[PDB]
Amino acid sequence: LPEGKIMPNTVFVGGIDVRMDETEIRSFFARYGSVKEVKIITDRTGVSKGYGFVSFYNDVDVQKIVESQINFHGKKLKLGPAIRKQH
RNA sequence: GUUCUU
Ligand SMILES: [Zn+2]
Numbered sequence A: 001l002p003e004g005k006i007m008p009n010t011v012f013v014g015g016i017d018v019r020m021d022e023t024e025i026r027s028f029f030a031r032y033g034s035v036k037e038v039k040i041i042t043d044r045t046g047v048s049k050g051y052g053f054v055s056f057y058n059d060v061d062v063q064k065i066v067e068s069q070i071n072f073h074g075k076k077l078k079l080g081p082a083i084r085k086q087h
Numbered sequence B: 001g002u003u004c005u006u
Helices: A022-032
Strands: A005-014 A035-042 A048-056 A078-084
Touching: A022 A035, A022 A048, A048 A078
Parallel strands: none
Antiparallel strands: A005 A048, A005 A078, A035 A048
């Protein structure tokens, strides 16, 4: 039974490859607004889970952003609305 | 492939 809340003004970014970095994602997403955070999710040992979230200070149309074809280092980012489920 | 993280 579907869970979580849709986070406003935030985009899920999956398919983040080890050859990529936060800075190029940050710089790209500035085309849509003032980026608040590029937050890559890691495990407890600091190992990337290969996805993260880009949030904005301004209102963005997430539906439109997730249509974008954004490639880095030979790989296409996998975009979606950001959903937050329940140290 | 949906977030502990001022
Ligand atoms: Zn903590």
